[PDB]
Design a protein around this ligand. Sequence first.
Ligand SMILES: [Mg+2]
Lengths: 45, 120, 293, 592
Amino acid sequence: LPKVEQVLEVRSVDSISMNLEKRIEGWNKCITRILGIPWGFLIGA
Amino acid sequence: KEIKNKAPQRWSQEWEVELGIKVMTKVIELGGTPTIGDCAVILRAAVRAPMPSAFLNILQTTHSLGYVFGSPLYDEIITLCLDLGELDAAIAIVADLETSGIKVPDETLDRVISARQSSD
Amino acid sequence: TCGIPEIAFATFENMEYGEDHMKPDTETYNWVIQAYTRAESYDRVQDVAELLGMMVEDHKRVQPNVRTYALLVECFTKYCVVREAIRHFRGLKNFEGGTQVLYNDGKYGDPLSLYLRALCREGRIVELLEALEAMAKDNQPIPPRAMILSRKYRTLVSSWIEPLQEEAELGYEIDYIARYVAEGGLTGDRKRWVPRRGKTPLDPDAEGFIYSNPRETSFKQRCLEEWRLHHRKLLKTLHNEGPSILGKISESDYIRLVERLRKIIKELDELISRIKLHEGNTEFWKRRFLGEG
Amino acid sequence: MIDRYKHQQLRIGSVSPQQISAWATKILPNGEIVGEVTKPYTFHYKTNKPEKDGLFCERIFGSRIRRYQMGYIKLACPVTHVWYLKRLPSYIANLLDKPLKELEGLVYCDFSFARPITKKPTFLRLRGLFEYEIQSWKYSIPLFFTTQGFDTFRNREISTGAGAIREQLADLDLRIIIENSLVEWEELGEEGHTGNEWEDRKVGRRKDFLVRRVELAKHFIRTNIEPEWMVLCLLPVLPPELRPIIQIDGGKLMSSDINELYRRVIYRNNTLTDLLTTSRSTPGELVMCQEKLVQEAVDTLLDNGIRGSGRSVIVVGPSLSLHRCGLPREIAIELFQTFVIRGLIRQHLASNIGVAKSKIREKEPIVWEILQEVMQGHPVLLNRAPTLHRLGIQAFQPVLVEGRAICLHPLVCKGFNADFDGDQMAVHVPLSLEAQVEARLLMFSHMNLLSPAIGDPISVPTQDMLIGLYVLTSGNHRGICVNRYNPCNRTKEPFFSNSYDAIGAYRQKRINLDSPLWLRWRLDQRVIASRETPIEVHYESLGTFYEIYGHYLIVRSLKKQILFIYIRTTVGHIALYREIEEAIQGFSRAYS
Ligand SMILES: [Mg+2]
């Protein structure tokens, strides 16, 4: 039950998994680097 | 795509007066009548940066619209025309002044006549 | 024409998420844009943008007409968003008689006058020149909204000049009594420039605009702003996507270029000239997404 | 398909000092304006009568009109809302571009602004945001011009209290504020002055405050809500019945904490207005202290206003069907008293409500007959007190049963999380036609048998039913446990032509439930078995061979013809098969 409560109400994205946090912090940086056009923001989102 | 990626043009007062004269002439052609100050400010801008190329038309449009400026300002323009050595523009200015009928002060009148005779 | 955009958005939702025979068309989008534009309740500026995003349906024959461009220009001008107002006004100009449709008989705030005044205030006069010369081609007179400031020199030919809020020297002294008699006084009522407590637009030029008139800037300020923004986007492009260039003197070229560009925003000139910025070209981004670029 | 297009818009907003009068001010015969509370005591001692101009008084508060009528109290000094200032989101501080410290001071302590209201030409150059003490010549300046000549202009520069905040919020140009805020946002963040975390954190906090200020200011331009309404120039009064008031008997007062808070604030307000009316040359210290006292009192009052079927055991009834439920007699009559009284007054044997009630209390057979006739086809709803599952509320048809416990079906009881302890059951009876149709067509048990989680049957046989089915379909021993010696050295029950004969022989106690037998199968060809070849095939010379399997026997002639089929099973399997088949057939026949 605590696992469900903490994965539903996410305190922080790295709490459920550090892999997801690393992937998101890579995605945002690499999608600000290349594809600066709004299409880049769209595909990153 | 043709206009969005082209670099802009830098600022200059000559460009300002060149666009202002065409804006005022097209707004007069369209049916609008600017006030006396609207042309007084563009005359001030035209006399700030030396450019006697449009000094004739900027006042011909005003005196054709039906408005006349003050006397103590028609002399500074005619003496700045001689300050930079543009005597033909001064001749054109006094010609259109005589054509319009505005009374130029006699002091600056004999001054510009002496300048003309020095150029003649 | 009711004044509540929700009763029209409900019908639009019923049409859009329904069967094929009841799918909306250009007229439906125009009516919903009109309902969300001429409201008198709240902001309603994000709803128009969301609806225009929904209107991007090329394969459903959902193409804009003159009224669509007119309504978009009106909505984006009434909310102080001019960089899209000019974009849509160009398309409105491509059609014949668009300026007559934009000036809807002067019934609702005179959108053409508001657009001209918005171009005049922000000092984007190159756009104004196009907007002016597009009028006499369609035989459209200037609307009576040639508002003059308390200083009787404000027109479409005065704001872009360098001196702002300053009377121009006209020789003889200003006839204040003559101006007072001509503008009003001695009969009827005169526009008294007196502050009040009610939330009423004080300046007569902010009558049609929703919040207030745009910030007053001359042409020199706007030109230097666009120049510094151009150089800023150039340096932003060269920072991330511009590490390598055709010149192989980078050790001495980049150090000079970064400091020059950072001092400009706040003969080695050609090195920045051949820098090509890829913006607004969808093919370049598609190639980069496919993996080629 | 055009929708019905129903449109309902519930709007919320802050009231205006003018609209507050539209609630309590009422007309009178003489024409005197009424609606104000001017007396602290609401009731008379030892009289149990509402005192005039009190809290529970009459003609301004008073029987549903008394519960809906409200009052209003005029305040001599303005006060400020509780959650508009003290809370962490300080909208007034965001609208006035000043930190919370000074404003808190103006409201609570004594501090002074240079010129709160800027609408008239001022000549007192102070340039002071907040003055901790007064060092000016207040006696020389006021006595210089004229008496009463200082009062007419002092409010423009020297303003202290919540009135200063009100006047500051009143004449706020909401169109230049956004311009200055946007130009400050554009100027800030562009210089590029780096440093420690305390630098950029403070810069981010400042720009966030600026953006919040812009967002707050853009709303007031197009929302018809004026910003000077955040202070309470007039306080509403809660209606009497909403407040806890049962009755007044012998001077008894049921006043609650909010009532005593209202009494305190009205006492302090009338004392303040009396002090103001008595003498204007009194010391400023005492009057400012009293004004603070009323303000803190009204703030505490607003904060306090902000912060402030017969259950019977269930038994298992095996004789009941899936839709019927056993309803006790007393619960049934208590539920259908209205219907049985209507039935008595309708046809005959009743002339008034009292005679009908006396007949119902007399426990006559006629009232029970009418109760049964009423509850014959009227659906009833049963709901457990803990509604954990989604199927906790079901509908049943009540059956008149004797006892003090509700009888329910075992399957529904197992599906409703039955407990060993007495589980209380609430009984509700629908009234309208729509409720009855919904309960009869949607909420019945035969329409909800699959759980919404994944689709598994929620109504499954319970423990005893599973045990019975397992004993039926278990069989008996087959090998060393049924025979002692090897059968290789040396008959079963006779070949029963029909399962009816087998069940009849079992009821006659001639064969045991576990005794194997041979049942002639009518070549249905649905031979249920496993992928196992026969143990022996006796292929005779004439051409008819017997295929002996582990559970059945197939007698096949020469030209590929299934002559006979015999099944070796017990009475339990055939009993279950027969009962299921006969249930299906009886359902299909009763459908027609
Ligand atoms: Mg229990």
